[PDB]
Design a protein around this nucleic acid. Structure first.
Ligand SMILES: [Mg+2]
Ligand SMILES: [Mg+2]
Ligand SMILES: [Mg+2]
Ligand SMILES: [Mg+2]
Ligand SMILES: [Mg+2]
Ligand SMILES: [Mg+2]
Ligand SMILES: [Mg+2]
Ligand SMILES: [Mg+2]
Ligand SMILES: [Mg+2]
Ligand SMILES: [Mg+2]
Ligand SMILES: [Mg+2]
Ligand SMILES: [Mg+2]
Ligand SMILES: [Mg+2]
Ligand SMILES: [Mg+2]
Ligand SMILES: [Mg+2]
Ligand SMILES: [Mg+2]
Ligand SMILES: [Mg+2]
Ligand SMILES: [Mg+2]
Ligand SMILES: [Mg+2]
Ligand SMILES: [Mg+2]
Ligand SMILES: [Mg+2]
Ligand SMILES: [Mg+2]
Ligand SMILES: [Mg+2]
Ligand SMILES: [Mg+2]
Ligand SMILES: [Mg+2]
Ligand SMILES: [Mg+2]
Ligand SMILES: [Mg+2]
Ligand SMILES: [Mg+2]
Ligand SMILES: [Mg+2]
Ligand SMILES: [Zn+2]
Ligand SMILES: [Zn+2]
Lengths: 92, 73, 167, 100, 53
RNA sequence: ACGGAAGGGCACCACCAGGAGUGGAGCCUGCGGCUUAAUUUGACUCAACACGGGGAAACUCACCAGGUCCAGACACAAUAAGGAUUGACAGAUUGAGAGCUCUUUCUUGAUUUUGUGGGUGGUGGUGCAUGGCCGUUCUUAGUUGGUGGAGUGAUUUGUCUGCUUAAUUGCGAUAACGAACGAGACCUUAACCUACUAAAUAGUGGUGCUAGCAUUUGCUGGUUAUCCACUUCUUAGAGGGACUAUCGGUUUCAAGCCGAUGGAAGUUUGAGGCAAUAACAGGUCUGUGAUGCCCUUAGACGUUCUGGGCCGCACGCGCGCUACACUGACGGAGCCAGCGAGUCUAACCUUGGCCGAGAGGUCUUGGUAAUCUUGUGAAACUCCGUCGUGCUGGGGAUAGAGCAUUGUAAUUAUUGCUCUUCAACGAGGAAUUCCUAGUAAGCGCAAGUCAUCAGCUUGCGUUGAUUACGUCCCUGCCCUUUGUACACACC
């Protein structure tokens, strides 16, 4: 999975303030819901993050409810070079 | 499943990898100190005067305007 | 803009999807059921479990993304859907809740005999008329077989099964 | 004004409560109402072979679910219609209010 | 590429699939539920269907 | 357990008495065989063979001939910004505007590429390694504790002589005290309520406006801003309604049926759902992101694309459809159902006008539905007709030609329409299946499959027979006694 960083980051920011992501297990639609990027981009990148202890995943009727973990946000914090204690993904 | 015979010839001919030449993007070299640029630029304003028009044989090809530039001079 | 026939069929679809979500993600939190209440300009979901503080998490962190996970997939505007977690009554009187309890205990190397006795007798003092626990599959050999555990009495046939029996 | 109420739940014993609760409110308010009219239970049938396979005796059992509809006509001013449309809410019970 | 997903599945069996298990054979299309006959069976209780008669 | 053992009792998946049939013809569809590159595959009596909701043009698709791509996450190592790598116009090559590969130079720059581990995926194997589910044993009445009495125990027992119920359904000696499950009770559905509870989303009567026959008071109609009144019929919620009630016979004369009465309802009132213990190495790994192990994993058994195939055809079977003519065929007329379905961010059901031989098309309208298609004006049907016992106007298999619609695309004709062509079949042998009142049998409609297509199924309504109420002859089923050299148990 090689793909432009303008898509790697784009799902990475959108995951930060939202805290979680959903994506249908529908390959080849080329338009994710609420993200202009491709569906295959969303599924594979988060699969990479899940392998590196950052994200946890469920299948849920081929819907792939993607949710972030504690070690995920710290990696995202340095990845996006955001200020410390900027905003959480599930803040009230 | 007995086997696969592959009656077609040995056709694993995976293409080149944009074969590694030496340093590239040569405009030209002169002394003290002027340097100008050959490989005439595309007339499309979308290219920021940096692209190189590939001219193979009697036709020149663009890289940023992926394929749309065709003029012979 | 939908027929009333299709609405209540799709209404039951919402519950079945929600039920299979809340049993796969909240498996270790003692999830024991869910029900959906519909209000004008507001939707409610009651997650009935045992470890409600674990379902919500610290500062309601765990419930917050669950509310927002259900928020995005099911196409709900912000503030339209919210999840309220309430501790289920009579924990022992739940076939669903005693189901994952029998699950992790089996995954932790507990013996089939003791794990099945533990569930059945526990439900007895919880006020149930009777309990049934079945363990099928490969036990002590390659030749699979079933082994049945029970106490009290259970009515097998009749309408009371729908009224009383939880399975 | 001619407001009309509609109830389309699947549980009569739960649904007859809401219809009873709304007719008594206007009656104790001294407003003329059109009594609760109960539509026939439209039946949604799904019939399938029980077996997941294709073998064995061809057993065909049906799963049925029933839809119970009620609708009531009222004539009430704007002040009291607002407080009655936001009450009498029950789980699994759908109500829609249309004016004229 | 333009040959990966070109052929249409806008109609026919390949168009529909189980919303629950992404199968093609043994499906219910009535009322717009789109659950196959094995999946519709196990969630018949949850969906609202029952064996009255 | 079994007996081509006995006894008692049942069953139209048994038989009688019988009804319709099937087998005999043509077709459609499944299986085998053959054939092929492949004709993907599971199931072989009941308990495989219109079954996999399997009515496959592409998709599904799993088989075949080729073409791509990689979805190899991640860790380490290696090449490496003197650049790791990605894509590309034109032509060759290719079914193919797959640079897929090749000639050529452009293009983006750390995501990548290569090797080792490790993953992922699979309608690949194993249903004899599995879960769950479904069928069968076995629609019959049967199954099991606890505490207690005979043994040297395995075991017995409860759980039956018996009368009789469909039912260890009921009931009374007597070494047992109660119970649990099953049946039943229960839920759904079917018919009665002129009594309770309401309705132009349903109706009825009357009054307004208005049409026709008559004109004389009547009859048949229409009318939404003309209202008025009501709920028998239609919808409903809670209910009432049957419990075998009343009476004569039968049996230590211990409780139903008969005989009759009553009633809407007296084969648990009819029919369904649910449906015990224990088993089958029954089917299923082709529903699943439900799975163990095995296989495979980059010219992959992963995915996708193009064209084929699953239909192919000497033959043997299965489930079926159309029939072999006046109880008829065909033509004009009369003309009656209930079960259901239906579009939204979509293009569903569509009345009405018009065009067309028809198919069908065209322009608006109505409908998220008791208001609209729908009274689904179904068909078998009843009246007038034509025909006339001729393989004939029975029968329409085969073919030939044209017009349409669905579908990107129909050629091994998707299906509909039009004309022509007109075969077997003259009631079908051994065999064999189902069936007891609205039941058989005949007749069609809706829905599920559906972009198109029923000869299938699941339901619904329509017309409505003959023969019993039986027995153990057959084939099965249940309980007791007896015999057993049987125990994967008579194959
Ligand atoms: Mg006979
Ligand atoms: Mg026949
Ligand atoms: Mg049988
Ligand atoms: Mg079929
Ligand atoms: Mg076809
Ligand atoms: Mg095909
Ligand atoms: Mg293909
Ligand atoms: Mg088996
Ligand atoms: Mg099994
Ligand atoms: Mg004893
Ligand atoms: Mg003793
Ligand atoms: Mg004992
Ligand atoms: Mg009038
Ligand atoms: Mg008497
Ligand atoms: Mg009954
Ligand atoms: Mg399975
Ligand atoms: Mg494959
Ligand atoms: Mg076949
Ligand atoms: Mg059959
Ligand atoms: Mg006629
Ligand atoms: Mg009707
Ligand atoms: Mg004819
Ligand atoms: Mg027979
Ligand atoms: Mg249909
Ligand atoms: Mg009989
Ligand atoms: Mg002897
Ligand atoms: Mg002897
Ligand atoms: Mg022996
Ligand atoms: Mg012998
Ligand atoms: Zn440009
Ligand atoms: Zn499914």
């Amino acid at each position: 999975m090689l793909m432009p960083k303008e898509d790697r980051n784009k799902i990475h920011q959108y995951l930060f303030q939202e805290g979680v992501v959903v994506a249908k297990k529908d390959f080849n639609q080329a338009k994710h819901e609420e993200i202009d990027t491709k569906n295959l981009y969303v599924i594979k990148a988060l699969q990479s993050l899940t392998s590196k202890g950052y994200v946890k995943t469920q299948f849920s009727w081929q819907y792939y409810y993607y949710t972030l973990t504690e070690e995920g946000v710290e990696y995202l914090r340095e990845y996006l070079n955001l200020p410390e204690h900027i905003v959480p993904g599930t803040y009230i | 499943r007995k086997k696969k015979v592959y009656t077609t010839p040995k056709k694993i001919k995976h293409k080149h990898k944009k074969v590694k030449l030496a340093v590239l993007s040569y405009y030209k070299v002169d002394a003290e100190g002027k340097v100008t640029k050959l490989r005439r630029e595309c007339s499309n304003p979308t290219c920021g005067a940096g692209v190189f028009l590939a001219n193979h044989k009697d036709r020149l090809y663009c890289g940023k305007c992926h394929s749309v530039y065709k003029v012979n001079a | 803009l939908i027929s009333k026939k299709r609405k209540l069929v799709a209404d039951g679809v919402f519950y079945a999807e929600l039920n299979e979500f809340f049993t796969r993600e909240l498996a270790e939190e003692g999830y024991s059921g869910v029900e959906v209440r519909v209000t004008p300009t507001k939707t409610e979901v009651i997650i009935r479990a045992t470890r409600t503080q674990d379902v919500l998490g610290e500062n309601g962190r765990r419930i917050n993304e669950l509310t927002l996970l259900v928020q995005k997939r099911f196409k709900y505007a912000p503030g339209t859907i919210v999840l309220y977690a309430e501790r289920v009554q009579d924990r022992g009187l739940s076939a669903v809740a005693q189901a994952e309890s029998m699950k992790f205990k089996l995954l932790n190397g507990l013996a089939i005999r003791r794990a099945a006795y533990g569930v059945v007798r526990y439900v007895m003092e919880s006020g149930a008329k009777g309990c049934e626990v079945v363990v099928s599959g490969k036990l002590r050999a390659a030749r699979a077989k079933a082994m049945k555990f029970a106490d009290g009495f259970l009515i097998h046939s009749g309408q009371p099964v729908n009224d009383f029996i939880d399975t | 004004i001619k407001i009309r109420i509609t109830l389309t739940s699947t549980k009569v014993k739960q649904l007859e409560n809401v219809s009873s609760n709304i007719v008594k409110n206007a009656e104790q308010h001294n407003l003329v109402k059109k009594g609760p009219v109960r539509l026939p239970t439209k039946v949604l049938k799904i019939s399938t072979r029980k077996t997941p396979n294709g073998e064995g005796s061809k057993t065909w059992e049906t799963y049925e679910m029933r839809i119970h509809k009620r609708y009531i006509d009222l004539e009430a001013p704007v002040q009291i219609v607002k407080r009655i449309t936001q009450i009498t809410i029950e789980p699994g019970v759908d109500v829609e209010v249309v004016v004229a | 590429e333009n040959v990966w997903f070109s052929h249409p599945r806008r109609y026919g069996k390949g168009s529909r699939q189980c919303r629950v298990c992404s199968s093609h054979t043994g499906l219910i299309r009535k009322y717009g539920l789109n659950i196959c006959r094995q999946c519709f069976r196990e969630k018949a209780n949850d969906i609202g269907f029952n064996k009255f008669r």
